[PDB]
Amino acid sequence: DAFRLIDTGALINNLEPRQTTSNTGLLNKANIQALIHGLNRHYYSLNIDYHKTAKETKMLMNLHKEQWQSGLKMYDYEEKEESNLAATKSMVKIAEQYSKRIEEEKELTEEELKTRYVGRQDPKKHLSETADETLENNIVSVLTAGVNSVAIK
Amino acid sequence: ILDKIFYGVLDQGNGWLYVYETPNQDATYDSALELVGQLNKVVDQLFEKASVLY
Amino acid sequence: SLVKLFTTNELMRWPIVQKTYEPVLNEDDLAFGGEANKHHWEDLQKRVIEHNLRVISEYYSRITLLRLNELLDLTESQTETYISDLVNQGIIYAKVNRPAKIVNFEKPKNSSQLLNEWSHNVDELLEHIETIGHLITKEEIMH
Amino acid sequence: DHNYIENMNEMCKKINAKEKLIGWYHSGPKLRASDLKINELFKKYTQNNPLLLIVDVKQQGVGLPTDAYVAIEQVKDDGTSTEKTFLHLPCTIEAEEAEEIGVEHLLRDVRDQAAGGLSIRLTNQLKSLKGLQSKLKDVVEYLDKVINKELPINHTILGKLQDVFNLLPNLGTPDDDEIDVENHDRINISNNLQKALTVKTND
Amino acid sequence: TLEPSTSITLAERQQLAYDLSISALLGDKIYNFGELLHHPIMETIVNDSNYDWLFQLLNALTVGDFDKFDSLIKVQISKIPILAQHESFLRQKICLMTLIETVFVKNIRMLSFEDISKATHLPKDNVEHLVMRAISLGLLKGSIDQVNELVTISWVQPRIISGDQITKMKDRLVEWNDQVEKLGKKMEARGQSIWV
């Protein structure tokens, strides 16, 4: 945060509005009590913006030589095996919760439905997210193996 | 062989004993049967609930 | 020359090494020499044949049984007995076929094993074309 | 101005006395064999071989604009009576905790070196092929010049290419059979998961 | 690192060169026969009486001609008694040289035993000794299958890259350029919708 003194003289004659003229008025007001008291009775707090050239931006942004090469680098295959097995197993356990849920859960009063049938930590949604993340990955996995084989030989 | 303690097969007309020490079948495919298995129960339930709409 | 022989992987044949060391090392007492010691000289053969087998498993992945019997200068049945005994000690991993056709020395390749190795081969070529390029930049400077 | 370097240095150590002189940056574009002499000057001050870190300021391409080179004196099999030379060294980038958070605060891009979702990585597979092609092409036209335009026979370059041909993949190996087993596994799991999403949306 | 000074007498310079060649014949892992000719030490005097039979043995080994080795060897073994006492070492080098040459230039990484036997002018019994000796020296690594009568190499030791060979590399890479390239096109075209 950045600050610039105010003169006591300004505050005594109540001439302080001069310093806060023609502005958007966005002031950080985080931190109060003694700190804020001191600030109001001594300095003025105003915004900080960060300006940078696009030359600077690009140098920083650029990463490794091996960055643009990585797609033919591939995971060790013992880990892909492990991952395939973990996902099939996990969904099974949340699927139990989901079957129990739609036994009933067609009455009334929203919040009660969620406590009765464990609609909190909702199983349908948590399952839909895991199922898809794993599905997309497995497309990437195959894609790399086939390409590696064929491109090189 | 039948107890399973070397679990192989006896080739009678060639009078040789084949021994295979391969453990039980791949885990991954079996775990798929369990996942698909649940899903059938999910669908039966889904149709009853949906009967009201039809 | 004896110790280095038994720790090198050149194939040595019992009937040959025998004649060699008879007028030199067998004269010397202890282990060889005397009458008690001549009943120690005998065991030496065994040690040799079993050191040949250990090398042979690693180098020849498939070898015919018959060739092995000539090389070790042993009868077939005997040869078969020593192989079984060696697999037992766990030194080597082998599959012996009693119809006396072929002896297969094999290392189980689980699916992972071949794939991971192959993984490394692909990665290293990627690294090689990039590095080869770095040193090519330099050659332009020199010319 | 030699003297300047010593005067600057002592104030700088007060700030942080961990730091030591280790070499010099050169503002590119590109290596010179006049640098060999330059390097030697710095070596007087330094207790380690000075690093010549060519930070190229022209930022050509999106690839790293650092090559690193160190002056080493080595003997060589050709006949040369000791050669003095600059050997390429691998350049990577690491940033501190303090530094890293500055990089991310600055950036406002969507990013695409993230290699995150199906979309970024979809691009990334194509990007790598063409990445390779450009490099490969450079190797190829360079080989023509060696046996036609009398660029020296640099035995090191050729020597390295042998590993590439020896460790090149092969088909009809029982590895190839192995890849097919894996391919079936991954498509298999893909289908069970595909059906599983059909159920959720239908609810 | 030899002083550029020519103060070291020509007689001394040749004499030492001579020694290297003799060692290299009788060695077991040296294939720098070509290296010597690319170094000044031999390069500048190639007319001397000593440098007839001697250079010729070396070029004999390189191409793996056993008829050329035989003829020379009869004469030379007599002249120098060193080669007589190391008769076995000298006989082996021609054989070793030839098996590795053939494995390098052949692009397939398996070769039948029959090819080696005729190539090397040795019976088939002697093939199994030679591959075994070679894996042990570490010149090559691989496996021996007697039931497909193949020897599968999996590693080759670095070698000088002759002129002719520089041309070969270019060829393998040109072919691999086209493989990369044709593949990239399909994949550029398909899935056009998404590259963002």
CA distance A101 to A87: 21
Helices (H) and strands (E) in chain A, counts: 6, 2
Q: How far is CA B23 from CA A26, B15, B30, C19, C87, in A?
A: 70, 25, 14, 50, 21
Residues counted in chain A: 153
Grouping H, G, I as helix, E, B as strand and the rest as coil, residue D25 is strand
Q: Tell me the one-letter amino acid at E37.
A: L
Given CB atoms, is A53 within the 8 Å cutoff of chain C? no
Angle at D105 between CA D101 and CA D106, to 5 degrees: 120
Question: Residue A63 and residue D93: Cβ atoms within 8 Å?
Answer: yes
List, in sequence order, every residue forming a beta bridge with D73; answer none if it has no partner.
Answer: D84
- In whole angstroms, how far apart are CA A86 and each of A80, A83, B27, D187? 10, 5, 11, 16
The Cα–Cα gap between E13 and E6 comes to 10
The answer to whether the CB of A35 falls within 8 A of the CB of D81 is no
Give residues with Cβ within 8 angstroms of C112, minimum separation 6.
A77, A78, A81
Among D150, D151, D156, CA closest to D76: D156
Environment class of D158 (CB within 10 Å of its CB; exposed 0-12, middle 13-18, buried 19+) = buried
PDB experimental method:
cryo-EM
C-alpha span between D45 and D187 (Å, rounded):
63
- A39 to chain D, any CB pair closer than 8 A? The answer is no
For E149, residues 6+ apart whose C-beta sits below 8 A from its C-beta are: E112, E113, E114
| Smallest CA–CA distance from B34 into chain A, residue | A92
Provide the domain limits for residue C98. Answer: 60-108
Which of A57, A68, A131 lies at the smallest CB-CB distance from D63?
A68
- For D127, phi then psi, to 5°, come to -55, -40
Domain D1-109 sits in CATH at 3.40.140.10
Mutation target among A64, A74, A133 for the D interface, most CBs of D within 10 A: A64
Q: Does C119 touch chain A (CB under 8 A)?
A: yes
Which tokens is A60 given? 């920083």
Q: Which residue of A65, A72, A78, A144 is the best one to mutate when testing the C interface, meaning the one whose CB has the most C CBs within 10 A?
A: A78
Residues of chain E with C-beta less than 8 angstroms from the C-beta of A151? 179-180, 183
Secondary element (H or E) of residue A80: helix A77-101
> How far is Cα of residue D135 from the mean position of the Cα atoms in its chain?
13
Q: Do B31 and A88 touch (CB under 8 A)?
A: yes
Distances from the Cα of C84 to the Cα of A136, C77, C81, angstroms: 51, 11, 5
Q: Number of CB pairs < 8 Å for A and C? A: 26
Q: What angle do CA A33, A34, A35 make, to 5 degrees?
A: 90
Helix (H) or strand (E) holding A92: helix A77-101
Strands E140-145 vs C60-64: parallel, antiparallel or unpaired? parallel
| HEC sequence for chain C | CHHHHHCCCCCCCHHHHHHHHCCCCCCCCCCCCCCCCHHHHCHHHHHHHHHHHHHHHHHEEEEEHHHHHHHHCCCHHHHHHHHHHHHHHCCCCEEECCCCCEEEECCCCCHHHHHHHHHHHHHHHHHHHHHHHHHHHHHHHHC
Place of tokens 């009809």: D172
Chains in contact with E, where contact requires at least 3 CB pairs less than 8 Å apart: A, C, D
Q: Which residue is listed with tokens 């065991």?
A: C43
Sign of torsion over alpha carbons C117, C119, C122, C126 = negative
Q: Which of E136, E65, E142 is nearest to E97 (CA)?
A: E65
Resolution in A: 4.5
CB-count exposure of residue E103 (10 Å: 0-12, 13-18, 19+): buried
Answer whether C54's CB lies under 8 Å from C11's CB. Answer: no
- D139: closest CA among E158, C132, A69, E180? C132
Say if the Cβ atoms of A102 and B35 lie within 8 Å: no
E152 three-state secondary structure: strand
> For residue B19, what are the contacts with CB-CB under 8 A and spacing of at least 6?
B6, B8
In Å, how far are A62, C71, C128, D139 from A66, measured between CA atoms? 12, 52, 12, 18
- Which DSSP symbol is given to E148? T
If DSSP codes are grouped into helix, strand and coil, which group holds residue E183?
helix
The region, left, alpha or beta by phi > 0 then psi within -120 to 50, assigned to residue C30 is left
Preceding peptide of D29 cis, ω within 30°: yes
Residue E40 main-chain phi, psi, to 5 deg: -40, -45
In whole angstroms, give the CA distance from residue E103 to residue E66: 18
Query: Which residue, D175, D171, C65, is CA-closest to E146?
Result: C65
C110 in Cβ contact with C121 (< 8 Å): no
Closest CA to E27 of E15, E19, E37: E19
How open is the CA angle B18-B20-B26, to the nearest 5 degrees?
A: 145
Give the Å distances, CA to CA, from C101 to C52, C64, E151.
Answer: 20, 7, 20
Residues in chain E with CB shorter than 8 Å from the CB of A150 are 179, 183
Which residue, among C59, C53, C63, has the nearest Cα to C104 in the 3D structure?
A: C63
Residue E60 exposed, middle or buried by CB count within 10 Å (0-12, 13-18, 19+): buried
Placement of tokens 């490794």 in the chain: A64
Q: Taking a C-beta distance cutoff of 8 angstroms, is the pair C132, D157 a contact?
A: yes
Which residues in chain C are contacts of D88 at CB distance < 8 A? 131, 134-135, 137-138
Alpha carbons C66 and C102: distance in angstroms, whole number: 8
Sequence-separated contacts (24+) of D24-29 with Cβ below 8 Å? D24/D50, D24/D51, D24/D52, D24/D53, D25/D53, D25/D54, D25/D55, D26/D52, D26/D53, D26/D54, D26/D55, D27/D55, D27/D57, D28/D54, D28/D55, D28/D56, D28/D57, D28/D58, D28/D65, D29/D56, D29/D58
Backbone angles phi, psi at C61, to 5 degrees: -85, -35
Q: How far is CA C36 from CA C31, D100, D143, in A?
A: 8, 78, 72
Nearest C-alpha in A relative to E187: A147
Which of B28, B35, B39 minimises the CB distance to D185?
B28
Return the SS3 of E141: strand
Distance, in Å, from the CA atom of E126 to the CA atom of E123, rounded to the nearest integer, reads 6
CB atoms within 10 A of CB A63: 14
Q: Of E35, E101, E34, E37, which Cα lies nearest the Cα of E63? A: E101
Other C-beta atoms lying within 10 Å of the C-beta of residue E126: 13
- Chain position carrying tokens 């009458």: C35
Query: CA–CA separation, C68 vs C100, rounded Å?
Result: 11
- Asked if D127 and A146 count as a contact pair (C-beta separation under 8 A), the reply is no
**Residue in the block written with tokens 């930590």:** A121
Residue E7 CA neighbour count, 13 Å, CB half: 4
